Amino acid sequence: EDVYQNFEELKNNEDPSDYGVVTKETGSPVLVLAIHGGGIEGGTSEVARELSKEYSMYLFEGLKSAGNSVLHITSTHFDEPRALKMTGNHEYVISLHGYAEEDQQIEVGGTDRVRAADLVEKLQHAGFPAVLLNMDHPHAGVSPNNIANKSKTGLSIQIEMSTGFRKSLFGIFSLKSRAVTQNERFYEFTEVMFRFLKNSYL
Amino acid sequence: EXXXXX
Ligand SMILES: [Zn+2]
């Protein structure tokens, strides 16, 4: 259960300094989406911002010192207006999430079945712990109500990264210091992503 | 700084 059922309710209940919506619009067909950024699913902000060097980006960040879990709105309820505009303006969506798990794992889902499979293969061959989720797996990212699928095509890749995998990418795992302590593994991972996105979406 | 997506 989320604390809030939609963005309007969150906005009505939370101080605006405690969260932040950030966009980068470049006209690229692909949109990188991180609706659980900041301290909600830590590290998804940093991955998104790095990929924004080449792609359009939507980011929703929890900015509290603690308790950002209350700002999580699940994808099928996430209706912040700038996200609705950005998703609808793009052809494809890559959506970044984090789930609680100490082992390093990357779970890949989404509606774009051939691209999701390719990504898993590329990640595996590059030495990263990716698995493909299929359509009946929980949190497979296939609902039409999922914000990531409200694009021009409906084709998405949903990347869920375990806590252990995200913690491996930063010297200090905090809101304050993740961005400035990105390590060699962080750039190795995002370079595999850059290579995949450029090849996969021509 | 809180971890979850259908
Ligand atoms: Zn999430």
Coordinates of C-alpha atoms and ligand atoms in Angstrom, one line a residue:
Chain A
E1 CA 0.0 0.0 0.0
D2 CA 1.3 3.5 -1.0
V3 CA 0.6 6.4 1.4
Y4 CA -0.9 8.4 -1.5
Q5 CA -3.1 7.2 -4.4
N6 CA -2.1 9.8 -7.0
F7 CA 0.1 12.8 -7.4
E8 CA -2.7 15.3 -6.6
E9 CA -3.0 13.7 -3.2
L10 CA 0.8 13.7 -2.6
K11 CA 1.0 17.3 -3.6
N12 CA -1.9 18.2 -1.2
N13 CA -0.2 16.5 1.7
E14 CA 3.5 17.1 1.4
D15 CA 5.6 20.3 1.5
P16 CA 6.9 21.0 -2.0
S17 CA 10.5 21.3 -0.8
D18 CA 10.4 17.6 0.1
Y19 CA 10.1 16.4 -3.5
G20 CA 11.2 17.6 -6.9
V21 CA 10.2 17.0 -10.5
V22 CA 13.0 17.4 -13.1
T23 CA 12.8 17.2 -16.9
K24 CA 15.1 17.3 -19.8
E25 CA 13.5 17.4 -23.2
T26 CA 15.7 16.9 -26.2
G27 CA 13.3 15.4 -28.8
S28 CA 14.9 12.0 -28.6
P29 CA 12.5 9.2 -29.4
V30 CA 13.5 7.4 -26.2
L31 CA 12.6 8.8 -22.7
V32 CA 14.4 7.8 -19.6
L33 CA 11.9 7.7 -16.7
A34 CA 12.8 7.6 -13.0
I35 CA 9.6 8.2 -11.0
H36 CA 11.1 6.9 -7.7
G37 CA 14.2 8.9 -7.6
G38 CA 15.9 10.7 -4.7
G39 CA 15.8 8.7 -1.5
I40 CA 12.8 6.6 -2.6
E41 CA 14.8 4.1 -4.6
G42 CA 18.3 5.4 -4.1
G43 CA 20.5 5.6 -7.2
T44 CA 17.8 5.8 -9.8
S45 CA 18.3 9.5 -9.9
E46 CA 22.0 9.1 -10.6
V47 CA 21.5 6.5 -13.3
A48 CA 18.8 8.7 -15.0
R49 CA 20.9 11.9 -14.9
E50 CA 23.9 10.1 -16.5
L51 CA 21.7 8.7 -19.3
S52 CA 20.2 12.2 -19.7
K53 CA 23.5 13.2 -21.3
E54 CA 22.1 11.6 -24.4
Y55 CA 18.4 11.1 -23.9
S56 CA 15.3 13.0 -22.7
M57 CA 14.6 12.4 -19.0
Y58 CA 11.8 12.5 -16.5
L59 CA 12.8 12.4 -12.8
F60 CA 10.6 12.5 -9.7
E61 CA 12.8 12.7 -6.5
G62 CA 12.1 12.2 -2.9
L63 CA 14.2 14.8 -1.1
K64 CA 13.5 14.1 2.5
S65 CA 16.4 13.4 4.9
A66 CA 14.4 10.2 5.9
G67 CA 11.0 8.7 5.2
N68 CA 11.0 9.1 1.4
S69 CA 9.1 5.8 1.2
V70 CA 5.9 7.8 1.8
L71 CA 6.5 9.5 -1.6
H72 CA 6.4 6.3 -3.6
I73 CA 3.5 6.2 -6.0
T74 CA 3.3 2.9 -7.9
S75 CA 3.7 3.2 -11.7
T76 CA 0.0 2.4 -12.4
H77 CA -1.1 5.3 -10.1
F78 CA 1.7 7.8 -11.1
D79 CA 0.0 10.7 -12.9
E80 CA 2.1 13.7 -12.1
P81 CA 1.2 16.1 -15.0
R82 CA 4.8 16.7 -16.3
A83 CA 5.3 12.9 -16.5
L84 CA 2.0 12.5 -18.4
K85 CA 3.2 15.2 -20.9
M86 CA 6.7 13.8 -21.3
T87 CA 5.7 10.1 -21.7
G88 CA 3.1 11.0 -24.3
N89 CA 5.6 13.1 -26.2
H90 CA 8.0 10.2 -26.7
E91 CA 8.1 7.0 -28.8
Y92 CA 9.7 4.7 -26.2
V93 CA 10.3 4.7 -22.5
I94 CA 13.0 3.1 -20.3
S95 CA 11.9 3.2 -16.7
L96 CA 14.3 2.8 -13.7
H97 CA 13.3 1.3 -10.4
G98 CA 14.8 -0.2 -7.3
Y99 CA 13.6 -3.1 -5.1
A100 CA 14.9 -4.3 -1.7
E101 CA 17.4 -7.2 -2.1
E102 CA 21.0 -7.5 -0.9
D103 CA 22.2 -9.7 -3.8
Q104 CA 23.2 -7.8 -6.9
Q105 CA 20.4 -8.4 -9.4
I106 CA 18.8 -6.5 -12.4
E107 CA 15.2 -7.6 -13.3
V108 CA 14.2 -6.5 -16.8
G109 CA 10.5 -6.3 -17.8
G110 CA 8.3 -4.1 -19.9
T111 CA 6.0 -4.4 -22.9
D112 CA 8.9 -4.2 -25.5
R113 CA 9.6 -7.9 -25.3
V114 CA 12.3 -8.2 -28.0
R115 CA 14.2 -5.2 -26.7
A116 CA 13.9 -6.3 -23.1
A117 CA 15.4 -9.7 -24.0
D118 CA 18.2 -8.1 -26.0
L119 CA 19.1 -5.8 -23.0
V120 CA 19.2 -8.8 -20.7
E121 CA 21.5 -10.6 -23.1
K122 CA 23.8 -7.5 -23.5
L123 CA 23.9 -7.0 -19.7
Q124 CA 24.7 -10.7 -19.1
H125 CA 27.4 -10.8 -21.7
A126 CA 28.9 -7.7 -20.1
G127 CA 29.0 -9.4 -16.8
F128 CA 26.0 -7.8 -15.1
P129 CA 23.4 -9.9 -13.1
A130 CA 20.3 -9.4 -15.3
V131 CA 17.3 -11.6 -15.7
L132 CA 14.3 -11.3 -18.0
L133 CA 10.9 -11.2 -16.4
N134 CA 8.0 -12.6 -18.4
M135 CA 4.5 -11.4 -18.7
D136 CA 2.9 -13.2 -15.7
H137 CA 5.7 -12.3 -13.3
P138 CA 4.7 -9.7 -10.7
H139 CA 5.8 -6.2 -11.5
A140 CA 6.5 -7.1 -15.1
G141 CA 5.6 -3.5 -16.2
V142 CA 3.0 -4.4 -18.7
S143 CA -0.1 -2.6 -17.4
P144 CA -1.6 0.0 -19.8
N145 CA -2.0 2.1 -16.6
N146 CA 1.8 2.0 -15.9
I147 CA 3.1 5.5 -16.6
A148 CA 6.0 4.0 -18.6
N149 CA 3.5 2.6 -21.2
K150 CA 1.6 5.9 -21.9
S151 CA 3.9 6.7 -24.9
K152 CA 3.2 7.0 -28.6
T153 CA 3.9 3.3 -29.1
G154 CA 3.2 1.7 -25.7
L155 CA 6.6 0.0 -25.9
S156 CA 8.7 0.1 -22.7
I157 CA 11.6 -1.5 -20.9
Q158 CA 11.3 -1.6 -17.1
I159 CA 14.7 -2.0 -15.3
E160 CA 14.4 -3.0 -11.6
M161 CA 17.7 -2.9 -9.8
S162 CA 18.3 -4.6 -6.4
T163 CA 19.6 -2.6 -3.5
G164 CA 22.8 -4.5 -3.6
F165 CA 23.4 -3.7 -7.3
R166 CA 22.7 0.0 -6.8
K167 CA 24.9 0.2 -3.7
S168 CA 27.8 -1.3 -5.8
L169 CA 27.9 1.8 -8.0
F170 CA 28.6 4.6 -5.4
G171 CA 31.3 5.2 -2.8
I172 CA 28.7 6.8 -0.4
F173 CA 25.1 5.7 -0.8
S174 CA 23.2 8.9 0.2
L175 CA 21.1 11.6 -1.4
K176 CA 24.0 14.0 -0.7
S177 CA 26.9 12.1 -2.0
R178 CA 25.9 9.4 -4.6
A179 CA 26.4 11.7 -7.5
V180 CA 29.9 12.8 -6.5
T181 CA 31.0 9.2 -5.5
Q182 CA 30.1 7.4 -8.7
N183 CA 32.7 4.7 -9.2
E184 CA 34.1 2.7 -12.1
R185 CA 31.3 0.2 -11.9
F186 CA 28.7 3.0 -12.3
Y187 CA 30.2 4.2 -15.6
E188 CA 30.7 0.6 -16.8
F189 CA 27.0 0.0 -16.3
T190 CA 25.8 3.2 -17.8
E191 CA 28.2 2.7 -20.8
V192 CA 26.5 -0.7 -21.5
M193 CA 23.2 1.2 -21.3
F194 CA 24.5 3.9 -23.7
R195 CA 25.7 1.2 -26.2
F196 CA 22.4 -0.7 -26.0
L197 CA 20.1 2.4 -26.4
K198 CA 22.1 3.7 -29.4
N199 CA 22.0 0.3 -31.2
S200 CA 18.5 -0.7 -30.2
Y201 CA 16.6 2.4 -31.1
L202 CA 17.6 3.5 -34.6
Chain B
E1 CA 19.0 8.8 3.1
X2 CA 13.7 5.6 2.6
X3 CA 14.7 0.5 -1.0
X4 CA 9.5 -1.5 -3.9
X5 CA 7.3 -0.7 -9.7
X6 CA 2.8 -3.6 -12.8
Ligands
ZN1 ZN 10.1 2.2 -8.3

